[PDB]
């Protein structure tokens, strides 16, 4: 029992780590979801050119486990980061009272949920499901274009979104425990959903500030 202004501080980082993990999910789902629909979509542009028929030569066959992959994948992550968004908010403020390890604890949780989204089993699933060939051409037909372009763009964008989110996650969570442990300062603002990414970069580790500016 020691009321003062700790509930406000804890509530800060609470949404911080959530803003990142949540931002990575929306971008992670866009790529994956774009791969499946983009596979049959691209192939169609090729056939429609003249053939005008389309089929399930692979675009559909792959689209099956594709959408289903990211589905259950993000389904857990998103559902977690979300439910934890508000939960952790009142959980961290209620844990600080009794003096718990919500700080080091959240680190084990956040990293857990990230290990999933960050590690899309679907990426290696489809990749290994075929194997016997790398990023290149070997089908002769014009279909290799959409396929190859999709194979590369798939893992490409996937790592493109996780690339930054990965470095930021290491910085946020890092300074996080340091903020509650060191206790540098405390702010009072019921941040709902307005420039949450901007305000974060301004008070985040020396690396996100670069993106905060270059991002209307």
Report whether 60 contacts 76 (CB < 8 A): no
- Torsion-angle region of residue 210: left (phi > 0), alpha (psi -120 to 50) or beta? alpha
Among 9, 7, 4, CA closest to 184: 9
Q: Residue 20's closest CA among 200, 211, 177?
A: 200
**How many domains does the chain fold into?**
1
Nearest to 38 by CA among 159, 162, 147: 147
Check residue 208 and report its DSSP letter. T
Angle between helices 143-182 and 121-130 (to 10 degrees): 150
**What's the CA dihedral at 170, 172, 178, 179 to 10 degrees?**
180
Q: Could you identify the residue written with the tokens 């930021």?
A: 168
Write the CB contacts of 50 (distance below 8 Å, at least 6 apart in sequence). none
The domain in which residue 196 lies consists of 1-216
- Inter-helix orientation angle 6-47/59-95, to 10°: 180
Q: What angle do CA 17, 10, 27 make, to 5 degrees?
A: 15
Q: Are 215 and 164 in contact (CB under 8 A)?
A: no
CA dist list (Å): 24 to 69, 164, 172, 185: 17, 9, 14, 28
| Long-range pairs of 120-129 with CB within 8 A, sequence gap ≥ 24 | 120/28, 120/32, 120/69, 120/70, 120/73, 120/158, 121/69, 121/73, 122/32, 122/65, 122/66, 122/69, 122/70, 122/73, 123/154, 123/155, 123/158, 125/65, 125/69, 126/62, 126/65, 126/66, 126/69, 127/155
Rounded Cα distance between 53 and 40, Å, is 12
Nearest to 36 by CA among 121, 128, 126, 143: 126
Closest CA to 117 of 166, 152, 150: 166
């Amino acid at each position: 029992d020691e009321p003062q202004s700790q509930w406000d501080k804890v509530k800060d980082f609470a949404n911080v780590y959530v803003d990142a993990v949540k931002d990575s999910g929306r971008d992670y789902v866009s790529q994956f979801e774009s791969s499946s629909l983009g596979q049959q979509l691209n192939l169609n542009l090729l056939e429609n050119w003249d053939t005008l028929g389309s089929t399930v030569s692979q675009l559909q066959e792959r689209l099956g486990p594709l959408t289903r992959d990211f589905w259950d994948n993000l389904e857990k992550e998103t559902d977690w980061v979300r439910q934890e968004m508000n939960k952790d908010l009142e959980e961290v403020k209620q844990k600080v009272q009794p003096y718990l390890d919500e700080f080091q604890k959240k680190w084990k949780e956040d990293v857990e949920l990230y290990r999933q989204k960050a590690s899309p089993q679907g990426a290696e699933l489809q990749e290994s499901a075929r194997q016997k060939l790398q990023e290149l051409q070997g089908r002769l037909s014009p279909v290799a274009e959409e396929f190859r372009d999709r194979m590369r763009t798939h893992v490409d964008s996937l790592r493109t979104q996780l690339a930054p989110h990965s470095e930021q996650m290491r910085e946020s969570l890092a300074q996080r425990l340091a903020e509650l442990k060191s206790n540098p300062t405390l702010n009072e603002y019921h941040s709902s959903a307005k420039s949450h990414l901007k305000s974060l970069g301004e008070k985040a580790r020396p690396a996100l500030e670069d993106l905060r500016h270059s991002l209307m």
